[PDB]
Amino acid sequence: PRVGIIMGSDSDLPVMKQAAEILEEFGIDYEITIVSAHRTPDRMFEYAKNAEERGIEVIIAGAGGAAHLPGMVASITHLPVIGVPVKTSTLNGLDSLFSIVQMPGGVPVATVAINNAKNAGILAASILGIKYPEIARKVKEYKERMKREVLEKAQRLEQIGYKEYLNQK
Amino acid sequence: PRVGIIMGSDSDLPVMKQAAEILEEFGIDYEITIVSAHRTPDRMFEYAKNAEERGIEVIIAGAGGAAHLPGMVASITHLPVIGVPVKTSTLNGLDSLFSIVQMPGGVPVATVAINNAKNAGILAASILGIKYPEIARKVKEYKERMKREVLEKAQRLEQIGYKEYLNQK
Amino acid sequence: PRVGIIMGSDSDLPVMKQAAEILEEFGIDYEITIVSAHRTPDRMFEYAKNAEERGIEVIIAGAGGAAHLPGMVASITHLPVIGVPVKTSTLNGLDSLFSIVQMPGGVPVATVAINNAKNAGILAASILGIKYPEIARKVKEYKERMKREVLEKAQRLEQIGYKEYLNQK
Amino acid sequence: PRVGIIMGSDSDLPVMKQAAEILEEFGIDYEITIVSAHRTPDRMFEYAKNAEERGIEVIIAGAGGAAHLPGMVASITHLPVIGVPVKTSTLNGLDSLFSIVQMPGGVPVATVAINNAKNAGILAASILGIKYPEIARKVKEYKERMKREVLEKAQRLEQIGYKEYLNQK
Amino acid sequence: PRVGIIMGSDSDLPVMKQAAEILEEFGIDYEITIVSAHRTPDRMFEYAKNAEERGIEVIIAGAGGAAHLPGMVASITHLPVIGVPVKTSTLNGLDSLFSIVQMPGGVPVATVAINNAKNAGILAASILGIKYPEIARKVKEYKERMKREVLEKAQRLEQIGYKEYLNQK
Amino acid sequence: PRVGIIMGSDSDLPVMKQAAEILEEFGIDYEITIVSAHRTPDRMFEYAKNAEERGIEVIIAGAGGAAHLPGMVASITHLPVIGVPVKTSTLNGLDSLFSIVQMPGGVPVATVAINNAKNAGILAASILGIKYPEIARKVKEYKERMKREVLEKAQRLEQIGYKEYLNQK
Amino acid sequence: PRVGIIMGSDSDLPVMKQAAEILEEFGIDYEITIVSAHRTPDRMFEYAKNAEERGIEVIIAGAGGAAHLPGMVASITHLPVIGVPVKTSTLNGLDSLFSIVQMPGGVPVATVAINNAKNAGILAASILGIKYPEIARKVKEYKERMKREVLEKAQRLEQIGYKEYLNQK
Amino acid sequence: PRVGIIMGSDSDLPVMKQAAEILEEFGIDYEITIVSAHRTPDRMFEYAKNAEERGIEVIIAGAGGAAHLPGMVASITHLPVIGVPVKTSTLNGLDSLFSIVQMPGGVPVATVAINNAKNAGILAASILGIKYPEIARKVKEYKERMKREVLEKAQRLEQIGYKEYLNQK
């Protein structure tokens, strides 16, 4: 099981590392690299064409602004492509979101929330989990952990009250 | 291989049938039914909890307005959930899109374009294709067909010119 | 008279405490806890189903992003549910607002301004006030106080002038 | 139990009648009239001031564009005020929504979806239901009916299939 | 010649003082005070009704969020009312702008840019200038000064170059 | 007393005639013509420069899309300029509104609602009314008529009910 | 002198033909064909790479939704690329506009108005006109014609009045 | 070969200097100065009219808010005009973008991304490059450099990993 995590700019790396961190938590092997739709277009084409042959099963692609990388990758490969819209300073990622999610009929990108590379990681795991029972188990376990974590927070708030909860937060 | 296609309202069925049509084109088995997050919440919970056990591997969920169904389904199941934002008369589906795509960290929905259930179908196939080589082949073949279809249109436009192309279109 | 104040994340607590503070000012009893639509969905269902039986008469629910908690609570309980859209870093709470206010026909949420949990508190009091004359009196008195406070500010500005008013502000 | 339904323009009546229809379904007494914030401001002031004394317990107010009526009513009365943003031809009710929902601290309006006067009716009933057990029962029963109605639609879709469902729809 | 400058909150005073400063530059007499549409509605009504009798000829009104003050003032008085939309932390004044500029037919507010109370001052002067030739002259002179100021900046940039211009800026 | 009504395109005339109709109702003399910022820029400059000398006291300017005409006119003349944003097919006049209302410091345009040339007419009258007591009286009388008209509608709705009101509407 | 006009879908041809019509009016030679970024990506790459060698000097590219074609073409060729955002049914071309205009640093697209292929034609001519004096003359002449056309309309409106102008329009 | 870089305010100079820097990198001669559409309108007219005669072949114009400068320049000159929308504090440059890009039919502005004067510089070079082979070569070389730079970053990320890449970044 392997995921490719790509982004156009190393300015995107603070956000996109979040997908790597989740995948590491799940024990899922990945590569993370730079592929610019606009500055290295041939490299993008080659990456998308060859990903399947190299054992990549899901691609997570991040891009900001006029964010073409996920969609262009999905136009080339038959693999599932997940798009992370990266927040822009001007339009707060709305440009990124529309550029990725609004793919015309024929070529989908699986779009997640602006700046939410953690969720692109979890979605990649959920996709992998239909094929790899071990990964399905890891996702189930993750969801139970998240539940337990909220239950503990709720219990604490109910026990110490908002004033004290905030003073310690 | 099985996909569940759900929607909250039969008003969503004109759009959501597009996912069924694609899946039929690919020979992928599916069920299509109504599950309302807001009017049948227990039914939604039960659907999401039991989908895996029944052999469903991907869920495609459509919702308009304050569109909670995809996200609530994804909160319950570990399966990949694809969200189709259905166009609203007031805000043209922008409310639908934000309600689906902006899932907080922990629980992803794979969001596609407003009203683009055809793309939710194709994405479901691409996801299935990592497990089922026959389906991967069908997606590859679909992409080659789409290519050939554009090449034929381009050739025709270049041969008869825009005036005549439009007169016959 | 009792109000339930819920939120999905303890990150929402700085905002949501504002509803608690108002209710305390009015002498209205409340509980405040964490209930995550997406990470503890069963807990949400159970909270909404049982609130009436426990004497809760109004629920104030806060959520950010794809903000499903108020709407899902309102789908389950017949009690009035007030939704506080919590500001997001990316879309400044616009995603939150659309996710809450745009509830389809059948299931309303009483939506107030982005990040305005103080107003969810006051609205809960106004609702309670139709049943509890003491609370109606407290709301009337609050409105008279707010009036008197503005009158004093106006008098001061007119007496010392904007320059000095700002220098002391 | 009594609800006041007001709107600034008789152009709003096609939408606002939806609240009257729901209230009639629930057996809740109401008045429906025209009160223009901008063309009859004294009338608005007088309506808001005197509503409580006349036995009105909830006000439903509709307005489009720069939609001030709900908020101005809520500034005057201590009663709960529900705001229906009416769709505008230019901005599709976004102007209406912001004008109503974004009330500053101190004065809430309970805002529902653009053009959704049906939901303002149901919310008024849910509010009344905390005081009047008969009304609480009517809301519970309404929610069970909505559930049963979706279950029947789902069963039908599963039995006759989407093609036939749409042909009869 | 007299202008009334009003605002709902002393939080608006940093912005609204800009109108006072311009008027002072033009030698135009004004009053500046607090009038809250939502917290002192009777005071607002009284202010608008009596402004003409007191010699006020133009009203400049600032408001943020669900910004009703300019429009409500204009509903009551026949005097020209200029609306300053004050920037909100959540929606950056877009809510303010729609609440003010989108007045339905019958009752106009003269709307200027978000947070641009300086321009409300200049517009008030331009309005006064049709009646008071001295004020018309002051506005003409202001426009010539603004021109001369830009010409001097342009000459400087052309003489010292952008690097040095920025180093001194 | 004289108002100049200008627009860039005769496509704007259906909307802009509304200002002429109001002015005619008030007995205010006006001219209405075409002045294109983008196709006849010299004509625009000349119109703005000479309006005062010809006895024009207020200019009403309409423009759609990148709507520069009001702002450019206001940059040249010291007279008050009122901007009507004309609705566009693509962005429903939002582009028009931002292009007009967001004038930087120094040069105001009095902006009214998208497509609301009727309100530009009334605002022009309110402005004229500070100088011409006869016009002030006409505006006062107009506001009383609008009030009486709403009172009659309200009485009718209360007398015949919504069903019948709508059947006759 | 030669311009390439490309679009991803023959659904874009009604809009994009407008650029061809202008170019024909100016006597500028062009080709018009279909090149889909998403369905024929290799064809797009090849088109962009080879355009210069074939004598193309400006490319006009139209795309709707997640509109990647102009930007991807500009990433490959050093030629000036003009982007026409094509209106979408859901978001009225706002998605198209952001996808095209918001190109990150390094790779520009010359973006014109949503659906305004006529302006992409004129811009292509203005660009060509710096090299070809005959084309510069044609653009100058076009601007003089547009001026004369507005002057004639203005004269007519002033002569027959708005009522009659509209009756004949 | 010569480019004119203009802006309305010296507040725009931090952004607009980016176009100068690129042009300097390409060895392209330019002038940079202040031309205010709204404060020096005659100067704007004169600049646009005379640019061709002075050897200017492309104009780059920056403006914020109601950003009329690019469009007004393009209305006057037959030269290609590139518009840089400058970010505003309130609406983050969305007002700027709509004011520039949404030019009606007849008069185009070549619009680039909000605050992206670097791209206006590169576009000016691409335009110049159709006439000046030396400049075409410089743009080709720039694109190859950008490619090589991304390839080196990608290699580094793949060699040292994201943790270390970020620690050194």
Swiss-Prot record, chains A, B, C, D, E, F, G, H:
This is N5-carboxyaminoimidazole ribonucleotide mutase. The keyword Isomerase applies. It is an enzyme of class 5 (isomerase). Its EC number is 5.4.99.18. Pfam families: AIRC. Catalyzes the conversion of N5-carboxyaminoimidazole ribonucleotide (N5-CAIR) to 4-carboxy-5-aminoimidazole ribonucleotide (CAIR). InterPro entries: PurE_ClassI, PurE_dom, PurE_prokaryotes. Keywords: Isomerase, Purine biosynthesis. Substrate binds at S9, D12, R39. GO terms for molecular function: 5-(carboxyamino)imidazole ribonucleotide mutase activity. Belongs to the AIR carboxylase family. Class I subfamily. The lineage of its organism: Bacteria, Thermotogati, Thermotogota, Thermotogae, Thermotogales. It catalyses: 5-carboxyamino-1-(5-phospho-D-ribosyl)imidazole + H(+) = 5-amino-1-(5-phospho-D-ribosyl)imidazole-4-carboxylate. GO terms for biological process: 'de novo' IMP biosynthetic process. Pathway: Purine metabolism; IMP biosynthesis via de novo pathway; 5-amino-1-(5-phospho-D-ribosyl)imidazole-4-carboxylate from 5-amino-1-(5-phospho-D-ribosyl)imidazole (N5-CAIR route): step 2/2. Signal peptide: none annotated.
